[PDB]
Amino acid sequence: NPLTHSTPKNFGIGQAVQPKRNLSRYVKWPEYVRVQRQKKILSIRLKVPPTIAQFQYTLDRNTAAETFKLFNKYRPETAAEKKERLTKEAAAVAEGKSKQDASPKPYAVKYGLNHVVALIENKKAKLVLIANDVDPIELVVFLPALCKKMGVPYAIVKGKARLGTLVNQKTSAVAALTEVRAEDEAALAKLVSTIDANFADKYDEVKKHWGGGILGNKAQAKMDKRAKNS
Amino acid sequence: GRVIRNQRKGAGSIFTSHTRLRQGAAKLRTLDYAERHGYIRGIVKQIVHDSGRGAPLAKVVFRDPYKYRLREEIFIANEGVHTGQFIYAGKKASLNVGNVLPLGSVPEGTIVSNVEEKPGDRGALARASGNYVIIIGHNPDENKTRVRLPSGAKKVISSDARGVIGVIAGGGRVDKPLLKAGRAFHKYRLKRNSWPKTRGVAMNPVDHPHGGGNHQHIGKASTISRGAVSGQKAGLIAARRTGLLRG
Amino acid sequence: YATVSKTHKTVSRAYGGSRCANCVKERIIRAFLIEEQKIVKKVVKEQTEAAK
RNA sequence: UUGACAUUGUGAAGAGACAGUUUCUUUACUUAUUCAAUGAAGCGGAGCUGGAAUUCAUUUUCCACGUUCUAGCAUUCAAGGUCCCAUUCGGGGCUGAUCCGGGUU
RNA sequence: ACGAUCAACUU
RNA sequence: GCUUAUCACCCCGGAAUUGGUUUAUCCGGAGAUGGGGUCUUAUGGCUGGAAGAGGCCAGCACCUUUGCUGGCUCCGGUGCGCUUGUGACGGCCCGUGAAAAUCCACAGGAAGGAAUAGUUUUCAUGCCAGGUCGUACUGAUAACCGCAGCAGGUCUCCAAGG
RNA sequence: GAUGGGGAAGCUCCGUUUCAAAGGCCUGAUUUUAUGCAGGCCACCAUCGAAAGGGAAUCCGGUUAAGAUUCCGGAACCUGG
Ligand SMILES: [Mg+2]
Ligand SMILES: [Mg+2]
Ligand SMILES: [Mg+2]
Ligand SMILES: [Mg+2]
Ligand SMILES: [Mg+2]
Ligand SMILES: [Mg+2]
Ligand SMILES: [Mg+2]
Ligand SMILES: [Mg+2]
Ligand SMILES: [Mg+2]
Numbered sequence: 001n002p003l004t005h006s007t008p009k010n011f012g013i014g015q016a017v018q019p020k021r022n023l024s025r026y027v028k029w030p031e032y033v034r035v036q037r038q039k040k041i042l043s044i045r046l047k048v049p050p051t052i053a054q055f056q057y058t059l060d061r062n063t064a065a066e067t068f069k070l071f072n073k074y075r076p077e078t079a080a081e082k083k084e085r086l087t088k089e090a091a092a093v094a095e096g097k098s099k100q101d102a103s104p105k106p107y108a109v110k111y112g113l114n115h116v117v118a119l120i121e122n123k124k125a126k127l128v129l130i131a132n133d134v135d136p137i138e139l140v141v142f143l144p145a146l147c148k149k150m151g152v153p154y155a156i157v158k159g160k161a162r163l164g165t166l167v168n169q170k171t172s173a174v175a176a177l178t179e180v181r182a183e184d185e186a187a188l189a190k191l192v193s194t195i196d197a198n199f200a201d202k203y204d205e206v207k208k209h210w211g212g213g214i215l216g217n218k219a220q221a222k223m224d225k226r227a228k229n230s
Numbered sequence: 231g232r233v234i235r236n237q238r239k240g241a242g243s244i245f246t247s248h249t250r251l252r253q254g255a256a257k258l259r260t261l262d263y264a265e266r267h268g269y270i271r272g273i274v275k276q277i278v279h280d281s282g283r284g285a286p287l288a289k290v291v292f293r294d295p296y297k298y299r300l301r302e303e304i305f306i307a308n309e310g311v312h313t314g315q316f317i318y319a320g321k322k323a324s325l326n327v328g329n330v331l332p333l334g335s336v337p338e339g340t341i342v343s344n345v346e347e348k349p350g351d352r353g354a355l356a357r358a359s360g361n362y363v364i365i366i367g368h369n370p371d372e373n374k375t376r377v378r379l380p381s382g383a384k385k386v387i388s389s390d391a392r393g394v395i396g397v398i399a400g401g402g403r404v405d406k407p408l409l410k411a412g413r414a415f416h417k418y419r420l421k422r423n424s425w426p427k428t429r430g431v432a433m434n435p436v437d438h439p440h441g442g443g444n445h446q447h448i449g450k451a452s453t454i455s456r457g458a459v460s461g462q463k464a465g466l467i468a469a470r471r472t473g474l475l476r477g
Numbered sequence: 478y479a480t481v482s483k484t485h486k487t488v489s490r491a492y493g494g495s496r497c498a499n500c501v502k503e504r505i506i507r508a509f510l511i512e513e514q515k516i517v518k519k520v521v522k523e524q525t526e527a528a529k
Numbered sequence: 530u531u532g533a534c535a536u537u538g539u540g541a542a543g544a545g546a547c548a549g550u551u552u553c554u555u556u557a558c559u560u561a562u563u564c565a566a567u568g569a570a571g572c573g574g575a576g577c578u579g580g581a582a583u584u585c586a587u588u589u590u591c592c593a594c595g596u597u598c599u600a601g602c603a604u605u606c607a608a609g610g611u612c613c614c615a616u617u618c619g620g621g622g623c624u625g626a627u628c629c630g631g632g633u634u
Numbered sequence: 635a636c637g638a639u640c641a642a643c644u645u
Numbered sequence: 646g647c648u649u650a651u652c653a654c655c656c657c658g659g660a661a662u663u664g665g666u667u668u669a670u671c672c673g674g675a676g677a678u679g680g681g682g683u684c685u686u687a688u689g690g691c692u693g694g695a696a697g698a699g700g701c702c703a704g705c706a707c708c709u710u711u712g713c714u715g716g717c718u719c720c721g722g723u724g725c726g727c728u729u730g731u732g733a734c735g736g737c738c739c740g741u742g743a744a745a746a747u748c749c750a751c752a753g754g755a756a757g758g759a760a761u762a763g764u765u766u767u768c769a770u771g772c773c774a775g776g777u778c779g780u781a782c783u784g785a786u787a788a789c790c791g792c793a794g795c796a797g798g799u800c801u802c803c804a805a806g807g
Numbered sequence: 808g809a810u811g812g813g814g815a816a817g818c819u820c821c822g823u824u825u826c827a828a829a830g831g832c833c834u835g836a837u838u839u840u841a842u843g844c845a846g847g848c849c850a851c852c853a854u855c856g857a858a859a860g861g862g863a864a865u866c867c868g869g870u871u872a873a874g875a876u877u878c879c880g881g882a883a884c885c886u887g888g
Pocket of ligand 6 (some may be wrong): 782
């Protein structure tokens with residue numbers, strides 16, 4: 001086209017007002033955003049005692065996916081199924097009455113912090129999943145040590161929300177299997193082996209390693225520059 | 231037994247500065263990317279008198295780099311700066327009177343004014359009429375610059391601190407005797423309520439440490455220590471010496 | 478000024494009722510001459526960048 | 530105003546006296562704390578492009594990064610170049626305007 | 635080279 | 646409504662034998678003097694408003710709501726005059742002597758717009774409405790304060806002749 | 808002088824844009840009716856503060872016992888629509 005021309009602007013200093021660029025790096029965020037970012041920064045800047053930072057060693061994606069595939073076969077009955085179970089029990093009480101247990105024994109994921117800790121202490125739990133993002137962390141920080149003491153396999157897994165949706169809650173912070181069906185015992189044993197290879201078998205070595213002490217991008221670059229010459 | 235005048239000044243009721251007619255705070259541009267990496271050109275529109283200030287003020291227009299508009303800046307005018315002159319401010323700006331440069335970008339012996347104490351404070355040193363800072367040395371190892379201040383003091387400043395080439399305009403102002411009370415009156419009615427001054431020895435003891443007596447006399451040493459408290463610091467505070475210098 | 482027609486408020490020229498017709502002439506001459514000088518400046522720069 | 534304890538953490542050196550302890554140097558780190566500014570706009574690292582390598586294409590390299598006779602002007606997600614669509618008085622992506630880290634400095 | 639008209643209040 | 650200006654500006658022209666010029670000495674090759682023009686409308690003039698009003702008189706009627714009828718209301722001069730407004734200047738400052746609401750103009754070019762009503766109209770005329778609160782009087786040798794109808798005190802505008 | 812925020816046992820004090828996620832313009836509008844997604848627009852921070860400062864627009868004649876640039880008569884002007 002002979003009627004169109006190449007203008008090009010000169011966005012150098014002192015000429016041609018700057019075009020709109022991405023300023024997402026310089027946004028003055030609201031205080032709550034700033035504090036929730038800086039808290040994570042401070043957590044990793046400080047030296048983390050081994051009792052913390054035993055967490056952020058979470059079960060990897062594949063083993064976690066298979067673990068939840070197993071745990072999803074033992075979801076506790078929701079209100080809809082419990083209501084009809086109670087109707088069946090009412091009918092059985094009306095006529096049948098074997099003793100009182102016409103309904104079969106349930107196999108369900110155990111959840112609830114106090115209930116799970118009691119199951120660990122009684123050594124009934126065969127596999128314990130601990131959420132990695134519990135705030136305050138004191139609620140579960142003793143759990144890996146307690147499981148090691150009781151000889152109960154445990155895994156630190158990502159997501160109290162994921163545990164919650166497993167047990168029909170918003171958040172669960174812990175989940176446990178104390179009994180599985182016969183067709184799932186071998187899968188449970190395979191999981192126990194893999195989980196122990198990552199958490200229980202490495203527990204004594206992890207317990208002596210301090211986390212944190214990590215620098216930011218600019219300080220890391222500056223220390224690399226200093227170390228290159230000094 | 232009464233709160234004395236120098237104590238009363240700090241409450242700042244009748245002792246605040248008279249700022250109605252002032253043109254605005256005189257300061258350099260906000261130190262931005264353009265001044266930090268290159269230079270930016272401004273235009274001197276006006277050289278205006280400022281109430282209560284001996285030195286005149288230059289009013290300089292810069293283009294906004296990020297939005298389409300003009301930004302006014304109130305500089306303190308240096309000697310020789312004229313209306314319609316182009317001012318260049320930045321690291322790569324030239325060594326000409328009126329230009330704003332980092333102290334690390336000028337040779338030793340350069341005469342600058344409105345010098346920042348820290349980079350980005352927009353000017354703190356050598357602001358009164360006829361005053362200037364002399365650049366006397368550089369320490370590129372620590373990114374520092376030695377300067378001589380108007381008081382004769384030697385100072386070390388960041389080499390990123392900016393200054394304006396030249397000397398503040400209006401020099402020689404204090405070389406003219408006022409000759410009369412009314413000229414001091416008009417001088418201070420544009421500044422603050424500090425004039426006239428009553429001598430402490432002309433007061434009663436209730437009003438001043440120097441008050442009282444059957445003759446006017448201070449009666450005790452007028453050299454007051456640093457550790458004296460408010461109401462005691464009247465006279466020559468922490469004086470290393472007194473009397474006429476060289477006999 | 479909100480009551481009278483546009484004729485009372487401007488002059489039939491660029492910058493009609495804001496500049497004084499000598500400043501407009503000066504603006505025109507300065508714009509033309511500086512633009513031509515910019516062309517000369519970049520031609521000189523392109524010439525002196527061919528020395529090597 | 531001066532000292533002590535608390536806020537108060539992390540590396541080293543190394544005066545040492547001596548499995549360790551204990552005062553004592555000196556300097557280092559940044560996240561606590563403190564100062565300042567901005568409409569938190571261009572920070573840090575790397576790369577591209579230029580010139581001196583007495584380079585091994587092998588950055589054991591440094592400096593630069595579109596504006597300097599003139600009281601003009603500089604804004605419409607930018608023209609251009611490229612792709613996509615049932616395109617009309619068009620709409621969209623990339624590039625123009627290097628990449629990466631979201632630490633505003 | 636003056637003539638004609640009009641008009642104040644200073645010395 | 647028409648017209649009317651110091652200043653400012655424009656066109657022609659090219660100035661030493663320097664000229665123009667203020668009470669006050671500034672201005673001119675960065676273009677004077679001169680010739681011709683442009684503009685602000687402070688202000689004045691004429692016209693409309695408006696003689697129908699207002700003023701001054703003369704004749705009749707008269708408390709019959711109380712009048713009626715007619716005439717004239719014009720043309721000049723003067724100024725270191727007074728008061729006041731304003732203009733162009735000049736002196737003074739180490740003093741250079743408010744702010745905001747508000748209105749307008751320009752730059753820019755986003756959109757929109759063409760033939761028996763196709764856009765827009767800062768041009769003329771035409772239509773409707775403009776709420777609330779204050780508004781009397783004194784303002785002082787008697788309306789305020791001073792124990793009072795107190796020789797005190799209490800901000801300001803207009804200002805005839807000798 | 809509120810607000811955000813900080814101080815104070817507290818009555819309250821500081822501060823007036825601050826270390827805050829602090830808002831309203833045009834245009835698409837089927838006008839039973841108010842909206843639906845659009846894309847930026849400064850970042851100005853409440854409010855109070857003058858019957859002599861700033862400021863939209865009215866004059867003349869007449870009229871009352873006592874009101875008038877307000878009433879009557881005539882003649883204008885501004886603002887909003
Ligand atoms: Mg004295
Ligand atoms: Mg005395
Ligand atoms: Mg004493
Ligand atoms: Mg009245
Ligand atoms: Mg009255
Ligand atoms: Mg009255
Ligand atoms: Mg008000
Ligand atoms: Mg009256
Ligand atoms: Mg009327």
